[PDB]
Design an enzyme around this catalytic site. Structure first.
Site, short mmCIF file in Angstrom:
data_model
loop_
_atom_site.label_atom_id
_atom_site.label_comp_id
_atom_site.label_asym_id
_atom_site.label_seq_id
_atom_site.Cartn_x
_atom_site.Cartn_y
_atom_site.Cartn_z
N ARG A 70 0.89 -1.20 0.03
CA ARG A 70 -0.12 -0.05 0.05
C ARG A 70 0.81 1.41 -0.02
NH1 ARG A 70 -2.63 -3.13 3.85
NH2 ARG A 70 -4.21 -4.34 3.15
N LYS A 86 1.86 11.48 -11.40
CA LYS A 86 1.01 10.44 -12.22
C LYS A 86 1.93 9.11 -12.40
CE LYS A 86 -2.19 13.06 -14.78
NZ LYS A 86 -2.86 13.06 -16.37
N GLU A 108 8.21 19.51 -25.21
CA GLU A 108 7.76 19.74 -23.82
C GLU A 108 8.10 20.87 -23.05
OE1 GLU A 108 4.80 18.50 -23.05
OE2 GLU A 108 4.78 16.50 -24.29
N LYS A 161 5.08 23.71 -13.97
CA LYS A 161 4.31 22.49 -13.96
C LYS A 161 3.65 22.37 -12.49
CE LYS A 161 3.12 17.67 -15.07
NZ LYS A 161 3.66 16.33 -15.56
N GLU A 172 -9.04 25.44 -8.20
CA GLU A 172 -9.95 25.49 -9.23
C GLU A 172 -9.64 24.33 -10.42
OE1 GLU A 172 -10.72 29.69 -10.52
OE2 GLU A 172 -11.77 30.04 -8.55
N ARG A 183 -4.85 22.65 -15.03
CA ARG A 183 -3.98 21.48 -15.37
C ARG A 183 -4.27 21.06 -16.70
NH1 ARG A 183 -2.35 16.72 -11.31
NH2 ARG A 183 -0.58 15.76 -12.40
N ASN A 198 -2.04 19.95 -21.92
CA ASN A 198 -2.30 18.95 -23.11
C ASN A 198 -2.28 19.72 -24.35
OD1 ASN A 198 -2.64 16.59 -21.59
ND2 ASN A 198 -4.71 17.07 -21.02
N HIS A 208 -1.63 17.60 -27.63
CA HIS A 208 -2.07 16.21 -27.40
C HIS A 208 -3.20 15.71 -28.47
CE1 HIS A 208 1.09 16.68 -24.48
NE2 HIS A 208 1.13 15.62 -24.07
N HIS A 216 -2.14 13.20 -30.54
CA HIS A 216 -2.39 11.73 -30.44
C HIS A 216 -2.82 10.88 -31.66
CE1 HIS A 216 -5.47 8.53 -29.42
NE2 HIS A 216 -4.48 8.20 -28.68
N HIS A 220 6.60 10.34 -29.01
CA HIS A 220 5.56 11.44 -28.33
C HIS A 220 5.73 12.87 -28.65
CE1 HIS A 220 1.99 12.60 -26.05
NE2 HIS A 220 2.88 13.48 -25.49
N1 LIG Z 1 4.08 10.31 -15.29
C1 LIG Z 1 4.08 11.41 -15.98
O1 LIG Z 1 3.41 12.60 -15.37
C2 LIG Z 1 4.45 11.25 -17.28
C3 LIG Z 1 4.84 12.49 -18.27
C4 LIG Z 1 5.11 12.42 -19.45
C5 LIG Z 1 5.48 10.95 -20.17
N2 LIG Z 1 5.10 9.92 -19.21
C6 LIG Z 1 5.40 8.57 -19.77
O2 LIG Z 1 6.89 8.32 -20.07
C7 LIG Z 1 7.09 7.52 -21.04
C8 LIG Z 1 7.96 7.86 -22.25
O3 LIG Z 1 9.20 8.20 -21.47
P1 LIG Z 1 10.31 8.59 -22.34
O4 LIG Z 1 9.85 9.39 -23.51
O5 LIG Z 1 11.55 8.66 -21.22
O6 LIG Z 1 10.75 7.20 -23.07
P2 LIG Z 1 11.55 5.83 -22.34
O7 LIG Z 1 11.44 5.93 -20.85
O8 LIG Z 1 11.14 4.63 -23.23
O9 LIG Z 1 13.05 6.45 -22.75
C9 LIG Z 1 13.40 6.36 -24.17
C10 LIG Z 1 14.76 5.26 -24.73
O10 LIG Z 1 15.92 5.92 -24.06
C11 LIG Z 1 16.64 5.16 -23.17
N3 LIG Z 1 17.37 5.95 -22.24
C12 LIG Z 1 16.77 6.39 -21.34
N4 LIG Z 1 17.81 7.51 -20.43
C13 LIG Z 1 18.88 7.31 -21.46
C14 LIG Z 1 20.17 7.84 -21.75
N5 LIG Z 1 20.55 8.91 -20.58
N6 LIG Z 1 21.17 7.47 -22.31
C15 LIG Z 1 20.69 6.61 -23.27
N7 LIG Z 1 19.51 6.04 -23.41
C16 LIG Z 1 18.47 6.53 -22.28
C17 LIG Z 1 15.79 3.94 -22.67
O11 LIG Z 1 16.19 2.81 -22.46
C18 LIG Z 1 14.61 3.98 -23.71
O12 LIG Z 1 15.09 3.20 -24.80
C19 LIG Z 1 5.66 6.89 -21.49
O13 LIG Z 1 5.11 5.83 -21.27
C20 LIG Z 1 4.69 8.13 -20.92
O14 LIG Z 1 3.25 7.66 -20.79
C21 LIG Z 1 4.74 9.90 -18.05
#
Ligand SMILES: NC(=O)c1ccc[n+]([C@@H]2O[C@H](COP(=O)([O-])OP(=O)(O)OC[C@H]3O[C@@H](n4cnc5c(N)ncnc54)[C@H](O)[C@@H]3O)[C@@H](O)[C@H]2O)c1
Ligand SMILES: NC(=O)c1ccc[n+]([C@@H]2O[C@H](COP(=O)([O-])OP(=O)(O)OC[C@H]3O[C@@H](n4cnc5c(N)ncnc54)[C@H](O)[C@@H]3O)[C@@H](O)[C@H]2O)c1
Ligand SMILES: [Cl-]
Ligand SMILES: [Cl-]
Ligand SMILES: [Cl-]
Ligand SMILES: [Cl-]
Ligand SMILES: [Cl-]
Ligand SMILES: [Cl-]
Ligand SMILES: [Cl-]
Ligand code: NA
Lengths: 352, 360
Positions: free
Chosen positions: A120, A142, A184, A226, A236, A240, A244, A247, A251, A264
């Site tokens: 938990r 998130k 971003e 952020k 309110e 947030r 987006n 997006h 998307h 993305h």
């Molecule tokens: N929680 C949130 O608020 C939030 C916000 C935005 C995105 N996300 C999520 O994040 C995910 C995407 O994250 P991402 O864009 O980091 O993709 P990712 O985590 O797949 O990273 C991209 C690639 O780079 C590699 N990598 C990471 N750091 C590296 C480094 N320093 N050097 C070399 N390679 C490296 C990883 O192995 C991976 O293959 C999505 O699933 C999305 O839904 C979450």
């Protein structure tokens, strides 16, 4: 020579440390030698940055363990989550265990959620290693995993104990991934901070050269923006949504071009451009405001043009309310934008 | 007749409604026409109470769907949790959906955890249909599912929007399950409240005759007590709720899956704890007898299983839990209405308590 942001959440308040060579400061982790730490990362990031974190834990005197998950969005599932649970259980870890999520957004979300559910909730520390995760995963709490029937539909709001961001890890991050993240970075300037947008215009070269000072300042200001956007939403419920921007159109590109084809951030860039033009066609911004938005995304080496083979039908397919900029630094959720305007925005962006 | 208990947790405060015929009052759900609602129950409870609930949803005008999970603790897993996610997704439900958990503690915990994680949290209403769930699950926010290497190791603290307890549903509850529930009601009297223990002694027969006033008061009182213990734990005291669980789990582990009901093992466990307490001077002989007497009056097992030796208890209480000699930790009563966590209880005292309980 590093900035620190404190996300205000009372009992859950935490610090985001952002700087160069931070993986050498053990005090940013805030751990006792009695605490048992478990680093969860993927097979790619492990050999690169685990050692630095591991040495950081040995100096403190913590007992540690490493768990390497397979690298990829396809593995951001409940099954992999379970792999983290099984691991924590077979090694008899208690509710006092501290989990470190070392990796990109995929690891951040999966391990964060793993940390949220284990008995938990157990403390966890984020160590985002992609520009995108550093500017988006760091704030908001998130966490999620995918389901065959839907992306990010299983998850939780769970805050970390701390977030450590060493701008040096970006040096090994692939060029496209870095650019994807700038989408971003640029978004925050557009939707909420005019001064920050102007700063981005002037420092793009420096950012892409991986200038330490520029990176630190950029990431730090995104985290503050952020943090404030989220702080307002609790008073309110509505602001947030502004995060987006792009997006909706974005998307549609990812969904149509197949997930993993376009990153993305690249899809968010084109979506932002389409959103901006929609804003202009609606009279919310003028010609020159659009041109500045377009010009900066181009400078950041991002796609800004509607995909050659996507028809208007393809967009509607995945789209059927939009976040539109109302200037450079202000935005709003606009309701009731005519299809015709959206169609013309899409078509116009084939010329940009 | 109806009692209403507001569980105070700031922005997350929720009402617990307890009474006869509550399933005929749509207002208690706080829903709106056209609002999406899903009832998750099991194959056993569905035919008994789903129609009543569906009737309320139809009156209100809600678009609803029913998910019938398989009945059994063996299914309180992460994969069954995944089945609820799948159900919700195939209906394209948004964050505005309301999930109703209709069933016992198994449904309460699992669906609760489902509600907690679907799109990071959606509203859920808890309608506990077993006595145990009504007095132990309605307060505390604990939701969870089992993992092959650990019971309730995957979960979350998630509060419901409302809890609805219709005491009429106990009419169809098997006699054994009802009694198992009483082992927990009695627990509250032994460990936290003397007056309520006395009250339970006086009205036990009314409770078993399913008297509406008795049921409402008993269940309302248990919810109030737990609400205080929990709010007081935020400022330890909550651990006293484990009276008998140590001995209890040893019985459950030894006897095998779903042979003894949890409440049954807890009852005999409570008697062993009470005796151990008597030998240590923590309670007196007459106090031990009132505990023994009230559990028998509730038709619960109070004796050490005949086929289970002292060594059997030790393999579970000690060997398997890595607890060495002189390290046993037990929640023991210090009177009828107070208790404490006691450590270092000599194995010789536990040994004789286990033996003495073979013929109580
Ligand atoms: N929680 C949130 O608020 C939030 C916000 C935005 C995105 N996300 C999520 O994040 C995910 C995407 O994250 P991402 O864009 O980091 O993709 P990712 O985590 O797949 O990273 C991209 C690639 O780079 C590699 N990598 C990471 N750091 C590296 C480094 N320093 N050097 C070399 N390679 C490296 C990883 O192995 C991976 O293959 C999505 O699933 C999305 O839904 C979450
Ligand atoms: N979250 C908490 O604080 C908490 C507290 C105590 C127990 N629990 C959990 O509760 C679970 C046990 O709950 P339980 O004791 O209610 O068992 P249960 O939920 O399995 O219910 C027992 C049996 O009664 C049936 N049933 C339920 N209501 C009925 C009715 N009205 N008429 C006829 N049959 C009915 C069920 O189908 C089942 O076969 C355990 O997994 C335990 O971990 C949680
Ligand atoms: Cl190791
Ligand atoms: Cl993938
Ligand atoms: Cl293209
Ligand atoms: Cl149905
Ligand atoms: Cl029966
Ligand atoms: Cl135990
Ligand atoms: Cl005595
Ligand atoms: Na005493």
């Amino acid at each position: 020579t590093m900035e620190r942001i404190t996300v205000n959440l009372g009992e859950r308040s935490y610090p985001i440390s952002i700087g160069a060579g931070l993986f050498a400061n053990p005090a940013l982790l805030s751990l006792s030698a009695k605490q048992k730490v478990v680093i969860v990362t993927n097979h790619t990031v492990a050999p690169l940055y685990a050692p630095a974190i591991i040495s950081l834990l040995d100096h403190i005197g913590c007992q540690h363990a490493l768990l390497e998950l397979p690298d990829g969005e396809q593995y951001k599932t409940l099954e992999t989550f379970n792999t983290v649970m099984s691991f924590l259980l077979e090694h008899n870890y208690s509710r006092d265990v501290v989990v470190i999520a070392l990796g990109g957004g995929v690891i951040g979300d999966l391990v964060g959620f793993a940390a949220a559910c284990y008995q938990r909730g157990v403390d966890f520390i984020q160590i985002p290693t992609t520009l995108l995760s550093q500017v988006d995963s760091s704030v908001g709490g998130k966490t999620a995993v995918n389901h065959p029937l839907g992306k990010n539909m299983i998850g939780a709001f769970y805050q970390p104990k701390a977030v450590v961001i060493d701008t040096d890890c970006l040096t090994t991050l692939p060029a496209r991934e870095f650019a994807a993240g700038m989408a971003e970075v640029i978004k925050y300037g557009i939707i909420y901070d005019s001064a920050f947008f102007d700063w981005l215009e002037a420092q793009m070269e420096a950012l892409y050269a991986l200038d330490e000072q520029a990176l630190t300042y950029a990431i730090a200001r995104c985290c503050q923006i952020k943090a404030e956007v989220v702080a307002q939403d609790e008073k309110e419920s509505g602001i947030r949504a502004l995060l987006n921007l792009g997006h909706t159109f974005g998307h549609a590109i990812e969904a149509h071009m197949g997930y993993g084809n376009w990153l993305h951030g690249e899809a968010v860039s084109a979506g932002t451009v389409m959103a901006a033009k929609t804003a202009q066609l609606q009279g919310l911004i003028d010609a020159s405001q659009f041109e500045r938005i377009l010009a900066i995304l181009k400078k950041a080496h991002l796609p800004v043009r509607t995909p050659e083979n996507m028809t208007f039908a393809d967009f509607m397919q995945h789209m059927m309310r939009l976040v539109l900029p109302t200037s450079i630094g202000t935005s709003a959720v606009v309701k009731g934008v005519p299809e015709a305007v959206i169609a013309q925005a899409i078509e116009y962006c084939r010329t940009v």
